[PDB]
């Protein structure tokens, strides 16, 4: 799935809630959950463009009132080929 969706949260619990809502919502593959530093967590999903759009809308709505909340909900439909190197391929 070319598309990329990212959700960033303050704390892991909203990240989990966002991940779950993203993946229930549409055919998007979770490729990463990142502990960024300072309490930031980022969840990354790949998929087809509309599936990503729907998944990031859901995620954002799901995590917003959970814990410390949502920092960023973002969609990149087609990431530059260079960006792919800094993108997680499977969650670790």
């Amino acid at each position: 799935g070319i598309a990329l969706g990212m959700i960033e949260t303050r704390g892991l619990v909203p990240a989990i809630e966002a991940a779950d809502a993203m993946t229930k919502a549409a055919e998007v593959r979770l490729v990463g959950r990142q502990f960024v530093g300072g309490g930031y967590v980022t969840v990354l999903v790949r998929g087809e463009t509309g599936a990503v759009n729907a998944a990031v809308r859901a995620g954002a709505d799901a995590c917003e009132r959970v814990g410390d909340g949502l920092v960023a909900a973002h969609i990149i439909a087609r990431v530059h080929s260079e960006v792919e190197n800094i993108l997680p391929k499977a969650p670790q």
């Binding site: 809630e17 009132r65 959970v66 814990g67």
Partner: protein, 117 residues
């Protein structure tokens, strides 16, 4: 009506189908028991402290057992600490001349007969 864990943390839980200084300043508090019996620091959890509902080991439970009376005895301490501000006579001065180690600013030294040393 129904009690148990469902009644806890109301307003804290999310995801539910419905949703879907530690130590008290040293100046202010003086401890009843000092040492490991202190209570100035708030200890959370299963500590040995007793709440309002609890009755029984100390308090009236210790103090009411044995009868006592207190007198109003005449009390005036006689001690070195108590005598720290005892009236003293006029301090002696030194009128000597000649080099004699005649400091006037230090602690009071006396000589035979009460003289300033």
């Amino acid at each position: 009506r129904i009690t148990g864990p469902g009644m806890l943390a109301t307003g804290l839980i999310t995801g539910t189908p419905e949703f879907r200084l530690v130590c008290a300043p040293r100046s202010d508090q003086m401890d009843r028991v000092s040492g490991e019996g202190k209570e100035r620091c708030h200890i959370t959890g299963d500590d040995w402290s007793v709440n309002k509902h609890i009755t029984g080991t100390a308090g009236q439970w210790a103090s009411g057992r044995n009868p006592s009376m207190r007198g109003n005895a005449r009390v005036v301490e006689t001690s070195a600490f108590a005598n720290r501000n005892v009236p003293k006579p006029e301090k002696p001065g030194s009128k000597i001349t000649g080099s004699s180690g005649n400091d006037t600013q230090g602690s009071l030294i006396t000589y035979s007969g009460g003289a300033r040393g």
